[PDB]
Design an enzyme around this catalytic site. Structure first.
Site: not given
Ligand code: L4N
Ligand code: L4N
Lengths: 304, 304
Positions: A41, A143, A145
């Site tokens: 992503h 951030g 991820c």
């Molecule tokens: C904002 C955030 C905060 C903590 N951990 C992760 C995130 N981000 C997400 O969950 C995004 C939205 C869906 C996704 C899988 C494609 C990435």
């Protein structure tokens, strides 16, 4: 003496963390040998998240669009491929700090350490369990991820998790290092049901053995039970059914303490039926399920 | 979202750990620049522990009696000196992995990460607080002496604790990096009173703010209190008295959430007087005091 929720020393993982930027999105990557692994992503924009067509989005990207920075030095990307929900960015330089490592898919109920990172920099480390429903209750902000979960056996790091998503409920979902999600989850900004969760029975029992070893014994009683009787109680209290394989894994702790596994089950049965009565076990006022029998043995014997 | 008991990434500290052997005793040392720091009780034998005459024991030792091993390589000891309860072993080689560092004496109630080690090897990392009575509730077995506690501000490691002793009660005692014990403790195998401990009020309040930020709000009520009224409750429940300095440090969290500090105190007052009623806050069934207001701000904003 003393028993803590201990994480593995994160040094070997810290030396693998990099920052991956693609377009306007920045997240973390794992640099092992000449490959950087990160959530796919990173190639999305806000308009994509609802249901990204990852194949189409990736086709508009070239090697030079993936900006990979290890601390302060830039890595040259010579290839890119999508494997399930991860991107693999081939770089021209092998990470000099690559530890001995493996990619493993952990089972639900197993534990691991997470090195939370932002912009390729480590912020902290904590130990957690993969819930029976394949979610994790971590601490992840936007951030984070690409931050990974791992276990360490002497000099070998077994990477088991890469963070991808926060579900609308505030619980976390991610993949193994081949990009396969744990659980039914898909990498899209959509409400997604996590299954009914249960408490990890074998881990609570392991932790009750850790408590006895460290002096907390008030919960030991004069009773015993059977696997059948205990499992009726476990059913009522949303605990995972205990099997002979679980009893077998608790063998070392049963042998060390001299408390038969079914006797410890009878203590757990009484704690489930009566509660803690305002008392604590190893500094907790609830039944802890984030320590496996292996974790208890390791911590109680000082394995490095 | 999510809130975990996070430890600092331990990599910078891992590169400083060494094994120090003197006679038949082996423990951990901290190698920074060309100096190895370790507990002075490495020079004792079993007959000494009851009340060691450290000055006399050290006089029978020479530089060549201190065996210092960093992983697999041996360090050459060219000097030795005792400073309070620590030994400083001058070596001929500066640690190439010495991070930017400081030696700090933390205050009671402050938190830090511990890198538990055995034979110079890291076993795990956990976050804890220095209790108001100057003890720590760690996880330390024989051989863990010399393991250190620290905090990290960007690239600088502030070392604040070195482990020396397990009291007969199973709680832990140690020194700053100048070898001064925190608390009334002396390095001898003797029963030693730790003062009456209290709960770290400002930390519980910080953690209640962390809970609100992450969605756990059930404990918020329609009440307020004063510092005087709250401190009468804190007295009854063995909580540290709250001061305006503590209220001032909670300012960022009060500003972020819009919940006045005295309103959060009224929530804490009701939780102390009524208990949790079988409910949880951030996965805990008790009032957590191991997060400072600074820790909450750092974790809630992803500081690396
Ligand atoms: C904002 C955030 C905060 C903590 N951990 C992760 C995130 N981000 C997400 O969950 C995004 C939205 C869906 C996704 C899988 C494609 C990435
Ligand atoms: C056996 C152990 C376990 C955990 N932590 C520490 C220890 N060791 C000690 O407490 C010894 C006995 C008294 C001492 C200060 C001089 C060192």
């Amino acid at each position: 003496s003393g028993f803590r929720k201990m994480a593995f020393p994160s040094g070997k993982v810290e030396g693998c963390m990099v920052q991956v930027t693609c377009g306007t999105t920045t997240l973390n990557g794992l640099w092992l040998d000449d490959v950087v692994y990160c959530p796919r992503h990173v190639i999305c924009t806000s308009e994509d998240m609802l249901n990204p067509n990852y194949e189409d989005l990736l086709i508009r990207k070239s090697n030079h669009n993936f900006l990979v920075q290890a601390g302060n030095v830039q890595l040259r990307v010579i290839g890119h491929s999508m494997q399930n929900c991860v991107l693999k960015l081939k770089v021209d330089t092998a990470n000099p700090k690559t530890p001995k490592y493996k990619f493993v898919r952990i089972q639900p109920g197993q534990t691991f350490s997470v090195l939370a990172c932002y912009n390729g920099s480590p912020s902290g480390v904590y130990q957690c369990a993969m819930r029976p429903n394949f979610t994790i209750k971590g601490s992840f902000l936007n951030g984070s991820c690409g931050s990974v979960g791992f276990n360490i056996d002497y000099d070998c790091v077994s990477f088991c998790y890469m963070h991808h998503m926060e579900l609308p409920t505030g619980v976390h979902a991610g993949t193994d290092l081949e990009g396969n999600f744990y659980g039914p989850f898909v990498d899209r900004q959509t409400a997604q049901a996590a299954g009914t969760d249960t408490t990890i029975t074998v881990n609570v029992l392991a932790w009750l053995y850790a408590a006895v070893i460290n002096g907390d014994r008030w919960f030991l009683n004069r009773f015993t039970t059977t696997l059948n009787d205990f499992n009726l109680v476990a059913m009522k209290y949303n605990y995972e059914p205990l099997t002979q394989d679980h009893v077998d894994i608790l063998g070392p702790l049963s042998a060390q303490t001299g408390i038969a596994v079914l006797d410890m089950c009878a203590s757990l049965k009484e704690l489930l039926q009566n509660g803690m009565n305002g008392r604590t076990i190893l500094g907790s006022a609830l039944l802890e399920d984030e320590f496996t029998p292996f974790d208890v043995v390791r911590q109680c014997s000082g394995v490095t």
